[PDB]
């Protein structure tokens, strides 16, 4: 049985929630990841840093689908991220699909995750999550959104941002390249350029993981016969697809 | 309800009528008894409608979540297993008799699931009020190794059998086809043999025919 | 107690061992078709009723257990062990196999090294018996570590025993008769007493042989016991 | 005897060209005894309309429940809830009490604010959805409402006629039900506006 | 020994104060400032958002002003995430009341509830208190337009004009000078903005760094307005801060 | 002292010392393991050391048959390794029951890794000081190696090695795979794949092995089993041909 | 879940938390209550700071438990609310099972009992509040006044004060309250109450509130003009050398 | 037992039978089947033996609690909303309270009298006049006829008495007459003289 029914994250004299700051520091040391919003789609991406040339990078997904039109990515402690995607995926059903018969909108799911992340601050016997997530998604009534979530459970919507290692440099880069007229193709291109400075090693479709929330892909639905279901808006790129845009770059 | 499932050489097909009744009355002359569990695992239900839908959407919610966790496409046996274990726990109080079919990495499949928890396997199956009429046809025309088209005609004939002779079933034929290579093709109202003939006269009323005591605008704004 | 020192070790478990080491010495010997257990019982005074302070415990009908270190902990573990072997039998019909049983204790003991609201056991436990496919001797440490043995010993005189025990293994590669092992185990208890020499002691031997006891676990008493005393008593000189 | 026969009444909905109509009677019985001629069984939440026939205390509770739920929805979603979403919500909500259900016949009716589509739906006390595109009936004179709507209904009615069709379908069904009547109301729903009218009818 | 880590979040200091509460308040003193002003015919909420970046989507970020219901709003100073947990509880308490009594909740009843929830983390459970101070704007038919404040202590009080977060001493002083009881909403708008402008730790007060809301008077019914970023900018001009 | 050294909470650097310490405990058995993949099989090799004569060598093993199809090898103290094998077996059994099919090597790895992650967040539980290398010949992914650690991390490997000399063995294989230019030992028979593993271990560690200094597990479709001191030696005699 | 012992004995025999709870009371706004012949009055200091309060709604320091009993207090406001709520419930409950309202002592014993409970229970800290419960037992015309402390102790008083500078106003009441001749009228008792506050309040009239309880659920709160009228009376007396 | 209620211009009138019959014996010819929930809100009640009062008293107490906490009087509408809400819980309860009530109140804000009828299933409906049980069957016919929304309290008391004569004449149970109470802007008082009018 548990014994730590008390908060492990508490206010200090200065007003700091120590452990949250420390979790943020873990995210600083995380591999650079970022998101960019366009007029007709959102894109997220990160560097697949590998811990061994014998590991098969394909097996590990840093970019993951939460719902058919929402996708996530992170910087920080992977395992904490992994369990967050499992919990996030489920809540999207328990707290929404299973009662409104539709996926939740982007902002609401981000809330369900902030909610989880919040409770790890305040609750008995636990440390805060050691990750910052970027969530990209589209719903019918708000359009394409881009949200960030920190260990505190705070979330801010962005036009574009980057988190992790080279974050101040990248947001610097992004802050001068972005504008309200971007087309997905252009934002994909910028994301790849921002990520070039954040990588020392090889830079290609196998060392990069990049996904988008854009048009609906019937070729990805799995069935036909239902005219009101067009496929998911989440589409992950292949090594190939990336490299076509690297020659161009 | 009249529902069936028929296995063909490279897959499986399921069919259903579209009459939904409350006692002798026809609540809906065209509802869909074909339910998606996962893109390539569809399910046809009979018995208590709310139960067949709720137990379908519920398993399909989990099956999704499972497929995501495991990173593998969902299998017909998973959907079968989760269904029966649920139904069983509820001792038949969930009125759901189903025919679960589909294709997955391990090949094509066809199963039956009764409200109490028992499941069966086979190449041709039927459940519902037409369960006997349809099965009369299936026993008459099913052969081993049949083309996709042979199978669709057969599954569609078995549901007509139901529609006509059985009063528990009527209206139209829905069909879902699951071929091992391809995407599942849900053909809603694949057959519409029962169209109401043009009425003998328009019943539209001369405006004002109805007495009105009082009028009001209604406010939706803020 | 569930804390890892920077080295990778758990100090509480290591301390618990200390408590084992400074306890009396108990041992076990695997014979051709069974096992034998012996333990050193110090007589603090003429006041202790002789041969009526039993320390060796029986689990189910076929498993004998002996422990050196904190005695009450050792019972706690036998109690747990008896429950475990009963659930098993209740479900699976067959009486629990020795390895099966060794792991039941293994898992439970380990569980006490997982939390810091719980203290690990203060005993090393020697146990075994005969299952459908042979005799088995096992020893389980406060850390939950356990392995099968040819011979085992633990407590104040463990090296004394283990030295003598390795020699039996070597000078009898072909096996070892259960009656030989009874006698032999008494000798090893007497030699382990050279260390803990300051007090007078009492001996207690139990065995579990297919031929000599039917697979059941039983204590060596009276007649056969006196000769085991003898074998050793006069061999010591 | 039957919880759906104590209080009585009916609700019916229809679809016409760019509009939808929903109507109900105003009786509240206690078996044979007339108790209220002002029991409105039609409520709204934003631009979604809900009719609820059956056991009055359940009708009332469900209004109170869906009001609550839709408010928490608006506050969070920052928008008013659409018919299609609501229908699902009603079905979840009813099946939630699967083995102890509210004894009612709900009817959803409204126009999709975004798609400009007329939409309506029906349910059993445990949630089973019927999304027919023509009409929906419910309650103690559901047998008669089918009778009327089947003969009298035709697609694409213009609101001013759709009003005449539904009104006659309610009136004549109610007049053949001992437990329905005591006045009546008809809502006509369009994207721009909603119009509510009380009808004159026999009071026996 | 699992008791060696228990920070004892619910004890008294020798002086008779709750460390954790004071310390929670300390972090609140660094949150962007939030003002509340009450007129005879409306109420005004105004808040400086301290998370500031050009790429931030202001058009979406509901960071400081939230709505509990049709006639009640709040302004937050502290951990956004903490406030959100508390907000959802309040939103419901409003809806439970509505369902039970068929009358909207009177503004104080909802403040007192939410203030007790906080006061509890203060006295048991050994969990850190919620690091939030709230300013409540609401209108009911008993006390008309109302304004309140609550903090991690679970203590709440009522006001005519009030501030929370950074520079409250400063902000509160400026409010005493220029607030008059007869005020008219439009004045309160100009007073709240003027006030933030002279207390901001920034070179200038721009729309991109604001959230603004009003509660006002169809007829005999109350409209609750949240200003979009365009509306705040416009309003900033007239006032003469731009 | 620091509290942040003893429970699973963040240091000011953003680290969990407890997690790091549990990584050290994995080398406490001074045993190295390695795993490689065949054309349709998967092999794991583990060092076996039985210094005490009193130990029944037949009861000393860090290789476990989890499922009929999944195999697991562990680098770390036996009490925690057993704690894991049990769990994994239990999970393997349950997943079957519930979902209608055999738990895949990678799923079990994800699951066991999720649990490891929990001890990493919850302060009442300590991490287990072990590194589980699961293996199988999956019905979907084919021959597969997924290895999890105390941090909750797991990935899939072409081949891998773990233990004190993990590194020597690793660079040996990386090198082998440069020339090979593939992700597996191109061999039709598992018997030749086991041989290969043993050869490259001898090379990497620079040590000769008897039939009793090794422990070998092998996964083929539908079955995961271990070799005996004889099955091992026959394999060991074959390595005496070319070298 | 969380049951750590927050209120415990220190080597010399004190329970530190309870004492530190009284310290919170010491920093409370002076509360005071005095008993008349046929009435009881409760006065309460209110910080002079903000001229920016909304005094219609801001919680007032005197609270009714029933129609015939009130409760004043000093210490942590938020803790007080929790004591009041529990009290008003016990009041309504006592009527429901005894068909008769609570005696002021019973209500007090009850509240003090709750306070005591937080000193002797796990996971909870005591109440940083001390109180003044006063009223009239049903159909009784004899006035009553009690005080309770965080310890859970309570007793009846002819007159009493609690909070910041309470030490000083009890000094005033000890010398100015004749047991044998208690403020006969309602007016004398109220005047006497205000006078004791004017030693401590500093800019009296403006920041004082008086509540007057008489038998048969007759309770009224004084509007500052009426209270202020008493402050001008105080000058008159003092303004005669 | 008889529960009647009628709302007139500036008040609400409640009539409730005084008999309490247990077995074949009339244990009491004086029972007042009412409770004052609040100063301007009165509640008559009829139903199963213990439940009847246990419910009445529980509500009263609760409203008295709300009154004190807020130092305010809930509108008669809010009280009936709360009361239904409780009876509504009872119906799917382990054992339901089988009580029928009438809630007559004077809304001090809106200045109108209001009369609410709620049966044990939690069926609330607001009426000019009401009753529970069979009381409706004999009286309603007369109330439908004479009732005027502009009636005076005296006019109300007469139409009420007439309804009481019908019950007295055609109802096979001797209910030992009614106790009449009036709720108006000045509170609730009892007509202690209805034996002759």
UniProtKB/Swiss-Prot annotation, chain D:
GO MF entries: endopeptidase activator activity
GO biological process annotation, one example: proteasome-mediated ubiquitin-dependent protein catabolic process
GO-annotated cellular components: cytosol; nucleus; proteasome complex; proteasome core complex, beta-subunit complex
Location(s) in or outside the cell: Cytoplasm; Nucleus
InterPro entries per UniProt: Ntn_hydrolases_N, Proteasome_beta_3, Proteasome_bsu_CS, Proteasome_sua/b, Proteasome_suB-type
UniProt modified residues of type Phosphoserine: 30
Keywords linked to the UniProt accession: Cytoplasm, Isopeptide bond, Nucleus, Phosphoprotein, Proteasome, Ubl conjugation
Cross-link Glycyl lysine isopeptide (Lys-Gly) (interchain with G-Cter in ubiquitin), where in sequence: 69
Pfam families assigned to the protein according to its UniProt record, in alphabetical order: Proteasome
Family label: Belongs to the peptidase T1B family.
Quaternary structure (record): The 26S proteasome consists of a 20S proteasome core and two 19S regulatory subunits. The 20S proteasome core is composed of 28 subunits that are arranged in four stacked rings, resulting in a barrel-shaped structure. The two end rings are each formed by seven alpha subunits, and the two central rings are each formed by seven beta subunits. The catalytic chamber with the active sites is on the inside of the barrel.
This protein's name: Proteasome subunit beta type-3
Provenance organism: Saccharomyces cerevisiae (strain ATCC 204508 / S288c)
Gene symbol of the encoding locus: PUP3
From Swiss-Prot, chain E:
Location relative to the cell: Cytoplasm; Nucleus
GO cellular component: cytosol; nucleus; proteasome complex; proteasome core complex, alpha-subunit complex; proteasome storage granule
SUPFAM superfamilies found in the cross-reference section: N-terminal nucleophile aminohydrolases (Ntn hydrolases) (SSF56235)
Keyword Cytoplasm in annotation: yes
GO biological process: proteasomal ubiquitin-independent protein catabolic process; proteasome core complex assembly; proteasome-mediated ubiquitin-dependent protein catabolic process
Record key words, sorted: Cytoplasm, Isopeptide bond, Nucleus, Proteasome, Ubl conjugation
Location in chain, cross-link Glycyl lysine isopeptide (Lys-Gly) (interchain with G-Cter in ubiquitin): 99, 198, 228
Domain of life, source organism: Eukaryota
InterPro entries: Ntn_hydrolases_N, Proteasome_alpha, Proteasome_alpha-type, Proteasome_asu_N, Proteasome_bsu_CS, Proteasome_sua/b
Family the UniProt entry places it in: Belongs to the peptidase T1A family.
Other known facts: Present with 17100 molecules/cell in log phase SD medium.
Subunit structure: The 26S proteasome consists of a 20S proteasome core and two 19S regulatory subunits. The 20S proteasome core is composed of 28 subunits that are arranged in four stacked rings, resulting in a barrel-shaped structure. The two end rings are each formed by seven alpha subunits, and the two central rings are each formed by seven beta subunits. The catalytic chamber with the active sites is on the inside of the barrel.
PANTHER family: PROTEASOME SUBUNIT ALPHA/BETA
Name by which UniProt lists this protein: Proteasome subunit alpha type-3
Protein species of origin: Saccharomyces cerevisiae (strain ATCC 204508 / S288c) (Baker's yeast)
Gene (UniProt): PRE9
From Swiss-Prot, chain F:
Pfam families noted in UniProt: Proteasome (PF00227), Proteasome_A_N (PF10584)
CDD domains (UniProt xref): proteasome_alpha_type_6
Signal peptide: none
Keyword ATP-binding: no
Keyword annotations from UniProtKB, A to Z: Acetylation, Cytoplasm, Isopeptide bond, Nucleus, Phosphoprotein, Proteasome, Ubl conjugation
Compartment(s) where it occurs, according to its Swiss-Prot or TrEMBL record: Cytoplasm; Nucleus
A cellular-component GO term for this protein: proteasome core complex, alpha-subunit complex
InterPro entries: Ntn_hydrolases_N (IPR029055), Proteasome_alpha (IPR050115), Proteasome_alpha-type (IPR023332), Proteasome_asu_N (IPR000426), Proteasome_sua/b (IPR001353), Proteasome_subunit_alpha6 (IPR034642)
Principal subcellular localization: cytoplasm
This protein's record includes keyword Nucleus: yes
GO terms for biological process, alphabetical: proteasomal ubiquitin-independent protein catabolic process; proteasome-mediated ubiquitin-dependent protein catabolic process
Glycyl lysine isopeptide (Lys-Gly) (interchain with G-Cter in ubiquitin) cross-link, chain position(s): 223
Sequence positions bearing Phosphoserine: 228
Family: Belongs to the peptidase T1A family.
Extra facts: Present with 15200 molecules/cell in log phase SD medium.
Subunit structure: The 26S proteasome consists of a 20S proteasome core and two 19S regulatory subunits. The 20S proteasome core is composed of 28 subunits that are arranged in four stacked rings, resulting in a barrel-shaped structure. The two end rings are each formed by seven alpha subunits, and the two central rings are each formed by seven beta subunits. The catalytic chamber with the active sites is on the inside of the barrel. Interacts with CIC1.
Annotated PANTHER family: PROTEASOME SUBUNIT ALPHA/BETA (PTHR11599)
The protein's name in its UniProt record: Proteasome subunit alpha type-1
Organism of origin: Saccharomyces cerevisiae (strain ATCC 204508 / S288c) (Baker's yeast)
UniProtKB/Swiss-Prot annotation, chain G:
PROSITE patterns xrefs: PROTEASOME_ALPHA_1, PROTEASOME_ALPHA_2
Annotated keywords: Cytoplasm, Nucleus, Phosphoprotein, Proteasome
Pfam families per UniProt: Proteasome (PF00227), Proteasome_A_N (PF10584)
PTM sites of type Phosphothreonine: 58
Main localization, broad class: cytoplasm
Protein's cellular compartments: Cytoplasm; Nucleus
SUPFAM superfamilies, sorted: N-terminal nucleophile aminohydrolases (Ntn hydrolases)
SMART domains on file: Proteasome_A_N (SM00948)
Keyword Phosphoprotein part of the UniProt annotation: yes
GO BP: any one term: proteasomal ubiquitin-independent protein catabolic process
GO CC term, one of those recorded: proteasome storage granule
Task of the protein: The proteasome degrades poly-ubiquitinated proteins in the cytoplasm and in the nucleus. It is essential for the regulated turnover of proteins and for the removal of misfolded proteins. The proteasome is a multicatalytic proteinase complex that is characterized by its ability to cleave peptides with Arg, Phe, Tyr, Leu, and Glu adjacent to the leaving group at neutral or slightly basic pH. It has an ATP-dependent proteolytic activity.
Subunit structure: The 26S proteasome consists of a 20S proteasome core and two 19S regulatory subunits. The 20S proteasome core is composed of 28 subunits that are arranged in four stacked rings, resulting in a barrel-shaped structure. The two end rings are each formed by seven alpha subunits, and the two central rings are each formed by seven beta subunits. The catalytic chamber with the active sites is on the inside of the barrel. Interacts with CIC1.
Family of the protein in this entry: Belongs to the peptidase T1A family.
Gene name as annotated: PRE6
């Amino acid at each position: 049985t548990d014994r730590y029914s008390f908060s492990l994250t508490t206010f200090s004299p200065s007003g700091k929630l120590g452990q949250i700051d420390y979790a943020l520091t873990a995210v600083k040391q995380g591999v650079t990841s970022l998101g960019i919003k366009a007029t007709n789609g959102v894109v997220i991406a990160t560097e697949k840093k590998s811990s061994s040339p014998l590991a098969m990078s394909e097996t590990l997904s840093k970019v993951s689908l939460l719902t058919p039109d929402i996708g996530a990515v992170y910087s920080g402690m992977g395992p904490d991220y992994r369990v967050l995607v499992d919990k996030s995926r489920k809540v999207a059903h328990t707290s929404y699909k299973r009662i409104y018969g539709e996926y939740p909108p982007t902002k609401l799911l981000v809330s369900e995750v902030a909610k989880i992340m919040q409770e790890a601050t305040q609750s008995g016997g636990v440390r805060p999550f050691g990750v910052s997530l970027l969530i990209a998604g589209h719903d019918e009534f708000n359009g394409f959104s881009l949200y960030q979530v920190d260990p505190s459970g705070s979330y801010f919507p962005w036009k574009a941002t980057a988190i992790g290692k080279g974050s101040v440099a990248a947001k610097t880069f992004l802050e001068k390249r972005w504008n309200d007229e971007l087309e997905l193709e252009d934002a994909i291109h910028i994301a790849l350029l921002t990520l070039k400075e954040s990588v020392e090693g090889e830079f290609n479709g196998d060392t990069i993981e990049l996904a988008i929330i854009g048009d609906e892909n019937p070729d990805l639905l799995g069935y036909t016969g239902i005219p009101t279901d067009k496929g998911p808006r989440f589409r992950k790129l292949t090594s190939q697809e990336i490299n076509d845009r690297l020659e161009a770059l | 309800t009249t529902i069936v499932g028929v296995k063909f050489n490279n897959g499986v097909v399921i069919a259903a009528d579209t009459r939904s009744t409350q006692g002798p009355i026809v609540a809906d002359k065209n509802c869909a008894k074909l339910h998606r569990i996962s893109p390539k695992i569809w399910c046809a239900g009979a018995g208590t409608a709310a139960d067949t839908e709720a137990v379908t959407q519920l398993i399909g919610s989990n099956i999704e979540l499972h497929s995501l966790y495991t990173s593998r496409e969902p299998r017909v046996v998973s959907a079968l297993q989760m269904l029966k274990q649920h139904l069983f726990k509820y001792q038949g109080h969930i009125g759901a008799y189903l025919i679960v079919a589909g294709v997955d990495p391990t090949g094509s499949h066809l199963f039956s699931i009764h409200a109490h928890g028992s499941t069966d396997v086979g190449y041709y199956l039927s459940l519902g009020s037409g369960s006997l009429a349809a099965m009369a046809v299936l026993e008459s025309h099913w052969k081993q190794d049949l083309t996709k088209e042979e199978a669709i005609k057969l599954a569609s004939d078995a549901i007509q059998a139901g529609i006509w002779n059985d009063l528990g079933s009527g209206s139209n034929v829905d069909v879902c086809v699951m071929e091992i290579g391809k995407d599942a093709e849900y053909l809603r109202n694949y057959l519409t043999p029962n169209v109401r003939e043009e009425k003998q006269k328009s019943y539209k009323f001369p405006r004002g025919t109805t007495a009105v005591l009082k009028e009001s605008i209604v406010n939706i704004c803020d | 107690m569930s804390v890892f020192s920077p080295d990778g070790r758990n100090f509480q478990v290591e301390y618990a061992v200390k408590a084992v080491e400074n306890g009396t010495t108990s041992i076990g010997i695997k014979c051709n078709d069974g096992v034998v257990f012996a333990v050193e019982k110090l007589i603090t005074s003429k006041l202790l009723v002789p041969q009526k302070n039993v320390k060796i415990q029986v689990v189910d009908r076929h498993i004998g257990c002996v422990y050196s270190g904190l005695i009450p902990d050792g019972r706690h573990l036998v109690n747990r062990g008896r429950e475990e072997a009963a659930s098993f039998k209740k479900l699976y019909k067959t009486p629990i196999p020795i390895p099966a049983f060794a792991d039941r204790l293994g898992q439970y003991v380990q569980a006490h090294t997982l939390y810091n609201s719980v203290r690990p056991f203060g005993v090393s436990t020697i146990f075994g018996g005969v299952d459908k496919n042979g005799a088995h001797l096992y020893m389980l440490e406060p850390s939950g570590s356990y392995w099968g043995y040819k011979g085992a010993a633990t407590g104040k005189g463990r090296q004394s025993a283990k030295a003598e025990l390795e020699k039996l293994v070597d000078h009898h590669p072909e096996g070892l008769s259960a009656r030989e092992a009874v006698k032999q185990a008494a000798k090893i208890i007497y030699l382990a007493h050279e260390d803990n020499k300051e007090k007078d002691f009492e001996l207690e031997i139990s065995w579990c042989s297919l031929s000599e006891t039917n697979g059941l676990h039983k204590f060596v008493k009276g007649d056969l016991l006196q000769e085991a005393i003898d074998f050793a008593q006069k061999e010591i000189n | 005897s039957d919880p759906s026969s104590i209080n009585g009444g009916i609700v019916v909905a229809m679809t016409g060209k760019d509009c939808v109509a929903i109507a109900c009677d105003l009786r509240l019985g206690s078996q044979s005894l007339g108790v209220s001629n002002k029991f409105e069984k039609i409520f709204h939440y934003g631009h979604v309309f809900l009719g609820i026939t059956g056991l009055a205390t359940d009708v009332t509770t469900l209004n109170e429940m869906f009001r609550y739920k839709t408010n928490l929805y608006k506050l969070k979603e920052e928008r008013a809830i659409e018919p299609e979403t609501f229908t699902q919500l009603v079905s979840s909500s009813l099946y939630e009490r699967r083995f102890g259900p509210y004894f009612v016949g709900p009817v959803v009716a409204g126009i999709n604010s975004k798609s400009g589509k007329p939409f309506i739906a029906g349910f059993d006390l445990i949630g089973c959805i019927d999304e027919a595109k023509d009409f929906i009936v419910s309650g103690t004179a559901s047998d008669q409402l089918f009778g009327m709507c089947e003969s009298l209904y035709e697609p694409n009615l213009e609101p001013e006629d759709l009003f005449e069709t539904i009104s006659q379908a309610l009136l004549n069904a109610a007049d053949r039900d001992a437990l329905s009547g005591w006045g009546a109301v008809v809502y006509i729903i369009k994207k721009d506006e909603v119009v509510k009218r009380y009808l004159k009818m026999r009071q026996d | 020994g699992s008791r060696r880590y228990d920070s004892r979040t619910t004890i008294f200091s020798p002086e008779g104060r709750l460390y954790q509460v004071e310390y929670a308040l300390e972090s609140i003193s660094h949150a962007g400032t939030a003002i509340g002003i009450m007129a005879s015919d409306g109420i005004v909420l105004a808040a400086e958002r301290k998370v500031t970046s050009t790429l931030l989507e202001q058009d979406t970020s509901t960071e400081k002003l939230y709505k509990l219901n049709d006639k009640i709003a709040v302004a937050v100073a502290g951990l956004t995430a903490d406030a959100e947990i508390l907000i959802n509880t309040a939103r419901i308490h409003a809806q439970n009341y509505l369902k039970t009594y068929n009358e909207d909740i009177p503004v104080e009843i909802l403040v007192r509830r939410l203030s007790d929830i906080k006061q509890g983390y203060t006295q048991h459970g050994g969990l850190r208190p919620f690091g939030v101070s709230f300013i409540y704007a609401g209108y009911d038919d008993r006390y008309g337009y109302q304004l309140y404040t609550s903090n991690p202590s679970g203590n709440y009080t009522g006001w005519k004009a009030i501030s929370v977060g950074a520079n409250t001493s400063a902000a509160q002083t400026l409010l005493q000078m220029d607030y008059k009881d007869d005020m008219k909403v439009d004045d309160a708008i100009e007073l709240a903005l003027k006030t933030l402008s002279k207390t901001t730790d920034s070179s200038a007060l721009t729309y991109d760094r604001l959230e603004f809301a009003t509660i006002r008077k169809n007829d005999g019914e109350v409209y609750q307005k949240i200003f979009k970023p365009q509306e705040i900018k416009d309003i900033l001009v007239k006032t003469g801060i731009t | 002292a620091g509290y942040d050294r003893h429970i699973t909470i963040f240091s000011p650097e953003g680290r969990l010392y407890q997690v790091e310490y549990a990584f050290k405990a994995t080398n406490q058995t001074n045993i190295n393991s390695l795993a490689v993949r065949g054309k349709d099989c998967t092999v794991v090799i583990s060092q076996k050391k039985v210094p005490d004569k009193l130990l029944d060598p037949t009861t000393v093993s860090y290789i476990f048959c989890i499922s009929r199809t999944i195999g697991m090898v562990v680098n770390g103290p036996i009490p925690d390794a057993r704690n894991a094998a049990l769990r994994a077996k239990a999970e393997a059994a349950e997943f079957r029951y519930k979902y209608g099919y055999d738990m895949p090597c990678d799923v079990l790895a994800k699951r066991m890794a999720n649990l490891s992650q929990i001890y990493t967040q919850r302060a009442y539980m300590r991490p287990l000081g072990v590194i589980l290398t699961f293996v199988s010949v999956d019905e979907e992914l084919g021959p597969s190696i997924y290895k999890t650690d105390p941090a909750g991390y797991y990935v899939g490997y072409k081949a891998t090695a773990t233990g004190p000399k993990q590194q020597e063995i690793t660079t040996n294989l990386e090198n082998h795979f440069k020339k090979s230019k593939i992700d597996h030992i191109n061999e039709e028979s598992w018997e030749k794949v086991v041989e290969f593993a043993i050869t490259h271990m001898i090379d990497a560690l620079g040590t000769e092995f008897s039939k009793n200094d090794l422990e070998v597990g092998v996964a083929t479709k539908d079955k995961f089993f271990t070799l005996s001191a004889e099955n091992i030696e026959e394999r060991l005699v074959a390595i005496a041909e070319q070298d | 879940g969380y049951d750590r012992a927050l209120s415990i004995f220190s080597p010399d025999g004190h329970i530190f938390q309870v004492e530190y709870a009284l310290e919170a009371v010491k920093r409370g706004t002076c509360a005071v209550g005095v008993k008349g012949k046929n009435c009881v009055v409760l006065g309460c200091e209110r910080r002079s700071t903000l001229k920016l309060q909304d005094t219609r709604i801001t919680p007032s320091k005197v609270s009714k438990i029933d129609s015939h009993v009130v409760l004043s207090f000093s210490g942590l406001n938020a803790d007080s609310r929790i004591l009041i709520e529990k009290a008003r419930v016990e009041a309504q409950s006592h009527r429901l099972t005894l068909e008769d309202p609570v005696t002021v002592e019973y209500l007090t014993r009850y509240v003090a009992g709750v306070q005591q409970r937080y000193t002797q229970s796990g996971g909870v800290r005591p109440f940083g509040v001390s109180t003044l419960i006063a009223g009239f037992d049903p159909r009784d015309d004899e006035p009553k006044l009690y005080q309770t402390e965080p310890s859970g102790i309570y007793s009846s008083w002819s007159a009493q004060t609690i909070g910041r500078n309470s030490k000083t106003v009890r000094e005033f009441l000890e010398k100015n309250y004749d047991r044998k001749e208690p403020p006969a009228t309602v007016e004398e008792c109220v005047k006497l109450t205000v006078r004791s506050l004017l030693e401590v309040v500093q800019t009296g009239a403006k920041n004082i509130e008086i509540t007057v309880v008489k038998p048969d659920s007759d309770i009224v709160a004084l509007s500052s003009e009426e209270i202020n009228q008493y402050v001008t009376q105080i000058e008159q007396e003092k303004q005669e050398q | 037992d008889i529960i009647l209620g009628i709302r007139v211009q500036d008040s609400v009138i409640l009539a409730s039978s005084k008999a309490v019959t247990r077995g074949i014996s009339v244990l009491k010819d004086s029972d007042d089947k009412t409770r004052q929930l609040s100063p301007h809100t009165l509640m008559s009640f009829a139903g199963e033996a213990g439940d009847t009062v246990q419910f009445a008293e529980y509500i009263q107490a609760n409203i008295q609690l709300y009154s004190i906490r807020e130092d305010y009087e809930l509108s008669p509408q809010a009280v009936s909303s709360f009361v239904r809400q409780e009876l509504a819980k009872s119906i799917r309860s382990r054992r339901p309270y089988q009580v029928n009530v009438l809630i007559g109140g004077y809304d001090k804000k809106k200045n109108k009298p209001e009369l609410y009828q709620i049966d044990y299933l939690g069926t609330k409906v607001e009426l000019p006049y009401g009753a529970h049980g069979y009381s409706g069957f004999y009286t309603f016919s007369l109330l439908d006829h004479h009732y005027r929304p502009d009636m005076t309290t005296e006019e109300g008391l007469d139409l009420l008495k007439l309804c009481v004569q019908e019950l007295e004449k055609r109802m096979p149970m001797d209910f030992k007459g009614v106790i009449v109470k009036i709720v108006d802007k000045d509170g609730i008082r009892q007509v202690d003289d209805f034996q002759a009018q």
